[PDB]
Swiss-Prot record:
The gene is LCK. Binds to the cytoplasmic domain of cell surface receptors, such as AXL, CD2, CD4, CD5, CD8, CD44, CD45 and CD122. Also binds to effector molecules, such as PI4K, VAV1, RASA1, FYB1 and to other protein kinases including CDK1, RAF1, ZAP70 and SYK. Binds to phosphatidylinositol 3'-kinase (PI3K) from T-lymphocytes through its SH3 domain and to the tyrosine phosphorylated form of KHDRBS1/p70 through its SH2 domain. This interaction inhibits its tyrosine-kinase activity. Interacts with SQSTM1. Interacts with phosphorylated LIME1. Interacts with CBLB and PTPRH. Interacts with RUNX3. (Microbial infection) Interacts with herpes simplex virus 1 UL46; this interaction activates LCK. This is Tyrosine-protein kinase Lck. It is linked to A chromosomal aberration involving LCK is found in leukemias. Translocation t(1;7)(p34;q34) with TCRB. Immunodeficiency 22: A primary immunodeficiency characterized by T-cell dysfunction. Affected individuals present with lymphopenia, recurrent infections, severe diarrhea, and failure to thrive. Changing residue 118 to V: Found in leukemia. The SH2 domain mediates interaction with SQSTM1. It is an enzyme of class 2 (transferase). It comes from Homo sapiens. Its main location: membrane.
Length: 266
């Protein structure tokens, strides 16, 4: 309730993004500070379900993660957060400004995302929706993890999603697709796919392959074909995130540590 602010301190300016559950507008809080304001599409989700995402953000604060600012608990409900001037990493990499980024800056950002994921890891949470579209970029070209709508605290060894839940096959770990089971090692797999999105400047994973073809090739033991122009060192780091047995995948602090080493070396 202490995160509450009167609706009048906010003035929306333009839509940033939208979703099944509402939209995200850019705005100003008390005139001088730019903020992102997420709104709920009355009917889509229950108010609690919506605000659940903000209560989770109250427990997870870090520079590498999109910061909760305020909430408006009266209809229409708002979740106010930190504004990231350059939008989604997936879209930005395709802009004139992003096409220009060298492999050295691409490695820096990958390491920045792993550092955010390392904190999520140490705090016993999972994101479950790790992909370039859910990484936001600031005006100083730093990255922050966003969209904690699927994030969950893990107390007992894993998290199992409800029976009807569907997930982005190209981005989701085999165990999560097959049995709905998620752990931080599932996010590690997603991160490896996220890395392919970085090096290709926003391209769809598994170029030319449909979802069923991806599933089949993964079951045979194949993994994503080496992305074009991808350093072999990074590709082999990508493969570690794609180990069949979840426990064989590395931790995020190891991922971050190796990526920083690739960054310093380039």
């Amino acid at each position: 309730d202490e995160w509450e602010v009167p609706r009048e301190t906010l003035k929306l300016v333009e839509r940033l993004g939208a979703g099944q559950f509402g939209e995200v507008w850019m705005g100003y809080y008390n005139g001088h500070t730019k903020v992102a304001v997420k709104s709920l599409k009355q009917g889509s989700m229950s108010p609690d379900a919506f605000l659940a995402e903000a209560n989770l953000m109250k427990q997870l604060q870090h520079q590498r993660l999109v910061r909760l600012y305020a909430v408006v608990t009266q209809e229409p409900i708002y979740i106010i957060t930190e504004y990231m001037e350059n939008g989604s990493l997936v879209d930005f990499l395709k802009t004139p400004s992003g096409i220009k980024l060298t492999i050295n800056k691409l490695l820096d950002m990958a390491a920045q995302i792993a550092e955010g994921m390392a904190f999520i890891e140490e705090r016993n949470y999972i994101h479950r929706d790790l992909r370039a579209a859910n990484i936001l970029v600031s005006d100083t070209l730093s990255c922050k993890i966003a969209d904690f709508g699927l994030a969950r605290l893990i107390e007992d060894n894993e998290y199992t999603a409800r029976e009807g839940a569907k997930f982005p096959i190209k981005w989701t770990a085999p165990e999560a697709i097959n049995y709905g089971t998620f752990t931080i090692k599932s996010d590690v797999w997603s991160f490896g796919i996220l890395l392919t999105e970085i090096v290709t400047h926003g391209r769809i994973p598994y170029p030319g392959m449909t979802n069923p073809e991806v599933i089949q090739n993964l079951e045979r033991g194949y993994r994503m074909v080496r992305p074009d122009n991808c350093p072999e060192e990074l590709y082999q780091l990508m493969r570690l995130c794609w180990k069949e047995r979840p426990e064989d995948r590395p931790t995020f602090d190891y991922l971050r540590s190796v990526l920083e080493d690739f960054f310093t070396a380039t």
